[model samples]
Target: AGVMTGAKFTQIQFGMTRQQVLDIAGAENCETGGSFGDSIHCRGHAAGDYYAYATFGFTSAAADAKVDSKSQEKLLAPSAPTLTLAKFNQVTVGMTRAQVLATVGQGSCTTWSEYYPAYPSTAGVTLSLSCFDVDGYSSTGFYRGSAHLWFTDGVLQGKRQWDLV
Candidate 1:
């Protein structure tokens, strides 16, 4: 017997882009037909794999239906990491370079005369954000990592990490 989950399968009579299909079903939790026929459809993995394929004429309706069936289960899924603004109080306008170093570990690298009007321009303080990378495992496997650090008037502002951004 065919697997059914009360999913409504709409025929994909016309060709469409991966983005178009994702837009229709929402990238967060959608499915698309991969190399296999529409008869073999599922959610998340199917949609992501389809987008990775880049070919057209693949059965999308069935994939979409499968996603729809699991929409409720998928909706409760967690989200990927996102960028966020740093706090002001964490970093002030007059901390010495040593103090900053103490607050946050040594930066990957250092700049002497970086300029940022928003931050105080003093010898003791670093007024610009620092960027660096690290190595680690990710959903996509082993990869380089990156992070953005913010500083105000030579103090530690905040930091954000991006896996492959």
Candidate 2:
């Protein structure tokens, strides 16, 4: 969430859509430019530190626009190393939610649950899935399939993977 940085900037690669960059760059820090205001300029910040600044040129001004040109500068030394397959494998069963997150970094996660067929309770079985791409990127960058981690009761319970190699 900080300002622009090299590592973070590299992640906002060409061919990505505006929203994809926004998802990575944080929408609050991005600004638009160009005569048609089709370009996106971002100075991202996170955890009270300025990280990097980036300018994204799009193919068009519409929602369907994709990045045709990208540029950036590092404001601070970059941190938050990209997630790795080994680090993800370090997550074991019975680890706390925090431990799981620490092991795998942030994942595009979702929350939902199952209900007992016999009875209805205030809460269904609480479960979540934290997914990551083999490329170590989250969300929309997951084109090469992904790994799915299952958690219940705030602890890791199981895992499944897609075409990650």
Candidate 3:
């Protein structure tokens, strides 16, 4: 029902076992019950080759090759609206709300709470933007996480991110 998700193992230096690879990938879904052991299995969609190459630094001839090709296409293919911080310089301490929106477009989410009483008023606000891969992947792959844009006094201050599996 959603896009297949996989991980890019940029940090695996020592290499990983097949069991370890499966466990890590499965954990991302959070659907597999039980402890974080080799036996655990993940439900939902998965990019198995991506996970394998990433976790083990080793690629099976058939699977790894295909995964690599797919990844290359995914990165090079033109898709999704381009998002940039072109207006980053315009962010200032006292910019108005209209100015901010004009820079980053209307935010996807806005709220005020006890935790952030200053929102829409004294305190700054946070804007979240969700991005997804449009190449027939799951929405989870596309928008499971969001980018947090912080604003103070109606001006853009900074931003952060949270990527989920």
Candidate 4:
């Protein structure tokens, strides 16, 4: 409980097994239940590609990939690619949230949106709604003309590109 630190949180990266996390950070702050600590509670967002949300706060990424979100130290995770135009282009409609993440890590302002003004987004259990114009991608993707992504129930609904009118 008291052992977890920002530095320690920053220390974890992908490729580390649950056992490794148990060894380093102990299980008090872990999100898993039962004694063995087999499952990783990934909040509502989980790709099952090794991403996990510690019971304390913050989440872990997969395959040695950098945690999409960073620390208070501003320390980047081991390694993971941010969402890019190329990958976003590859995204398909009706894609699952996990698939969206697996396609391109959360490419926004740390909200992991897929949100909506109402409930039952896509699959009917979204924490937030659609990855709209939110971050660097949103900020820049619009300039040279780009398509804005729309999601429904956590699936890629569609995208529309627009240039200077």
Work out the TM-score per prediction: 0.26, 0.38, 0.28, 0.30
Shift of residue 69 alpha carbon in model 3, Å: 43
Where does candidate 3 clash, by residue pair? Answer: 2-138, 3-137, 3-138, 118-123, 131-142, 132-142
C-alpha positional error of residue 156 in candidate 2 after TM-score superposition, expressed in Å: 53
What are the per-residue Cα lDDT tens digits for candidate 4 across 1-165? Answer: 344443555465543455565556666545644652434432212223432333322223333322222122111121322445666677787787578667756543133332222222223423322232323332112223223455555566665544412
lDDT of each: 0.33, 0.56, 0.33, 0.41
Residue-wise lDDT of candidate 1 within 67-129, one digit each (tens)?
Answer: 111111111111222221232224344565566444434533232123322222233343343
Looking at model 2, residue 76 earns an lDDT score of 30
Clashing pairs in 1: 32-47, 125-154, 126-154
* Ten-residue stretch with the least lDDT total in model 3: 66-75
- In terms of lDDT, which candidate is strongest? 2
Which candidate number would show the highest TM-score if scored against the true structure?
A: 2
lDDT of 2 by residue, 3-90 (tens): 5555566676556778898888778777776553777777754333443456777767788766665544333321333445666678
| Candidate 4 colliding pairs, count | 14
The C-alpha local distance difference test score for the whole of candidate 3 amounts to: 0.33
lDDT of 3 by residue, 21-79 (tens): 44444445333224522222333333333321121222232322111101111211123
TM-score of candidate 3 against the unseen true structure: 0.28
lDDT of 2 at 81: 30
Q: Report the Cα lDDT for residue 130, model 2.
A: 34
Weakest lDDT window of 10 consecutive positions for candidate 1? 68-77
Ranking of models by lDDT: 2, 4, 1, 3
The C-alpha stretches of model 4 lying farther than 4 A from their native spots are 1-81, 107-148, 160-165
